[PDB]
């Protein structure tokens, strides 16, 4: 129930309060950020496998509520896209909660998506055959551009990430995800701050879904949980999971000493995890975290000599 063209027609749909439904009828190249902060929002974009492409450093999409009872919802689906921003194709920038769901989405970027880490929930959902890109460069349509990378402070240092979203990353069940890594340090970065209204970080695998991100080339940690009082990695029943990075495959080391978290990895009844480092530990968890494994699945777990 609405059918967009060009930047300004996205544009217009994305800032009408009432518009809900999204249809591309061509590929769309935004060479300014698109600001949505005009309160409760439900918003499906649908591609028809055209792309958008994200030029400006501001931003692709950005969700900017003030209120923090406001909630976006934004779907995309089948679509390509393209971003050089640090703060993602799409920045989810409310006080309160913002979801995002990308449904058999392809994308390439630097920094994909990023949140503000220290306000209302904050979702990524992951859903049919979606395959993320972390590159240096990408072109489309002749055109050449190099992407940035969004950098936070770590106790070891300063890290890129693929994705910055705090509360939750979640594949959906029938889901085949697969995220490609040449650009960043870490594929998958949740994280919440002290006015966080939740201190949940948790990433999901569905039911019968697959996540692979065999990125042992580049990244040096797949997955970096830093939840402020919890941090999940589910893999549920007849999931395949496939990961490799340098370092660690999951880490849950707390940013600061005065951090007191938990830990908690569930592989359950059917899944098959397979996971790889070469320097670090597969599931590397340290300091002060309370923190459980439950292995009920089958699990390989490699670490190369080095």
């Given at each position: 129930i609405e059918e967009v063209s060009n930047e300004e027609e996205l544009k217009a749909a994305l800032r009408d309060a009432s518009i809900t439904t999204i249809k591309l009828k061509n590929n769309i190249?935004?060479?300014?950020?698109?600001?949505?902060?005009?309160?409760?929002?439900?918003?499906?974009?649908?591609?028809?496998?055209?792309?958008?492409?994200?030029?400006?450093?501001?931003?692709?999409?950005?969700?900017?509520?003030?209120?923090?009872?406001?909630?976006?919802?934004?779907?995309?689906e089948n679509a390509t896209l393209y971003n050089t921003s640090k703060y993602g194709f799409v920045n989810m920038s409310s006080n309160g909660v913002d979801t995002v769901t990308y449904k058999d989405v392809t994308a390439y970027g630097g920094t994909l998506v990023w949140s503000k880490t220290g306000a209302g929930v904050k979702t990524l959902n992951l859903v049919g055959n979606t395959t993320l890109n972390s590159v240096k460069s990408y072109e489309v349509?002749?055109?050449?551009?190099?992407?940035?990378a969004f950098s936070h402070r770590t106790p070891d240092g300063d890290k890129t990430t693929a994705l910055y979203v705090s509360n939750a990353i979640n594949i959906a069940e029938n889901a085949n995800v697969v995220l490609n890594n040449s650009a960043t340090d870490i594929d998958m970065w949740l994280l919440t701050a002290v006015p966080?209204?939740?201190?949940?970080?948790?990433?999901?695998?569905?039911?019968?879904?697959?996540?692979?991100?065999?990125?042992?080339?580049?990244?040096?940690?797949?997955?970096?949980?830093?939840?402020?009082?919890?941090?999940?990695?589910?893999?549920?029943?007849?999931?395949?999971?496939?990961?490799?990075?340098?370092?660690?495959?999951?880490?849950?080391?707390?940013?600061?000493?005065?951090?007191?978290?938990?830990?908690?990895?569930?592989?359950?009844?059917?899944?098959?995890?397979?996971?790889?480092?070469?320097?670090?530990?597969?599931?590397?968890?340290?300091g002060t975290v309370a923190n459980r494994i439950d292995f009920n699945g089958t699990a390989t777990l490699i670490k190369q000599e080095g």
């Amino acid at each position: 129930i609405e059918e967009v063209s060009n930047e300004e027609e996205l544009k217009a749909a994305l800032r009408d309060a009432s518009i809900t439904t999204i249809k591309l009828k061509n590929n769309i190249t935004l060479n300014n950020a698109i600001t949505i902060n005009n309160g409760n929002r439900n918003i499906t974009i649908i591609g028809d496998g055209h792309y958008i492409n994200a030029l400006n450093s501001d931003g692709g999409i950005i969700l900017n509520n003030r209120g923090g009872s406001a909630k976006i919802d934004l779907t995309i689906e089948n679509a390509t896209l393209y971003n050089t921003s640090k703060y993602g194709f799409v920045n989810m920038s409310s006080n309160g909660v913002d979801t995002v769901t990308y449904k058999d989405v392809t994308a390439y970027g630097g920094t994909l998506v990023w949140s503000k880490t220290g306000a209302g929930v904050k979702t990524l959902n992951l859903v049919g055959n979606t395959t993320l890109n972390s590159v240096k460069s990408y072109e489309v349509d002749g055109q050449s551009c190099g992407t940035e990378a969004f950098s936070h402070r770590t106790p070891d240092g300063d890290k890129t990430t693929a994705l910055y979203v705090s509360n939750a990353i979640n594949i959906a069940e029938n889901a085949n995800v697969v995220l490609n890594n040449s650009a960043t340090d870490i594929d998958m970065w949740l994280l919440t701050a002290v006015p966080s209204t939740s201190g949940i970080s948790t990433v999901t695998v569905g039911n019968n879904a697959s996540l692979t991100m065999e990125n042992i080339g580049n990244t040096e940690y797949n997955i970096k949980l830093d939840g402020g009082r919890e941090n999940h990695f589910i893999v549920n029943e007849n999931a395949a999971v496939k990961m490799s990075a340098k370092v660690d495959n999951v880490r849950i080391i707390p940013q600061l000493e005065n951090i007191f978290t938990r830990g908690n990895i569930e592989l359950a009844k059917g899944s098959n995890v397979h996971l790889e480092v070469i320097t670090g530990s597969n599931f590397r968890v340290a300091g002060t975290v309370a923190n459980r494994i439950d292995f009920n699945g089958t699990a390989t777990l490699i670490k190369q000599e080095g």
